[PDB]
Design a protein. Structure first.
Ligand SMILES: [Mg+2]
Lengths: 109, 110
């Protein structure tokens, strides 16, 4: 309850502190985290209609679901997002037991 | 980057570790965080179409937007949701400078 408060505060501080675009998905491919730089890249003003969407709705060429399926990181992937060429790094997220529970893309210009 | 991986892992752990339903919104009333228990109570299988939705489209009687306006915690509100009766405690979430950046409801089984 207060513990959820502090987590939400640290979440927002980390996302805001990262200059690159961040998009995280869960195991089913739903976007669960996104920072302001990624929303700008995708052409959105805020999290409404972006969080809780399948990643392939907003990024049809995303390899984040392949990172979930394989557990394999992918680095230095060029891709086009809204007429801009960006470089994507994609890493799996694991729980304490080593199960892949999501994946993150980092986009830089 | 690695930091986001660790944060995601700690979030998931902490969201499962709470037995109450959790729903969190940002200052615009958009759902930004939810746990398995709140999803089950809402009648959803996953975060899809729950995250990123304005709170009153899923919880019409929610006072979470009231908490954003007033900056003030609200306790002991009885609620029907999954045809289940629950008690909602609602607090504001502040950044390190004490500005309100969101609000969270805890749902306790009556
Ligand atoms: Mg490419």
């Amino acid at each position: 309850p207060e513990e959820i408060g502090l987590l939400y505060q640290e979440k927002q501080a980390i996302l805001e502190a990262i200059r690159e675009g961040i998009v995280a998905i869960n195991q089913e491919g739903t976007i669960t985290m996104v920072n302001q730089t990624a929303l700008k890249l995708l052409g959105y003003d805020n999290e409404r209609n972006v969080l809780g969407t399948p990643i392939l709705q907003l990024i049809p060429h995303s390899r984040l679901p392949e990172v979930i399926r394989t557990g394999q990181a992918e680095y230095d992937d060029e891709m086009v997002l809204g007429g801009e060429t960006v470089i994507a790094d994609r890493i799996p997220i694991k729980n304490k037991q080593g199960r892949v529970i999501g994946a993150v893309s980092t986009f830089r210009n």
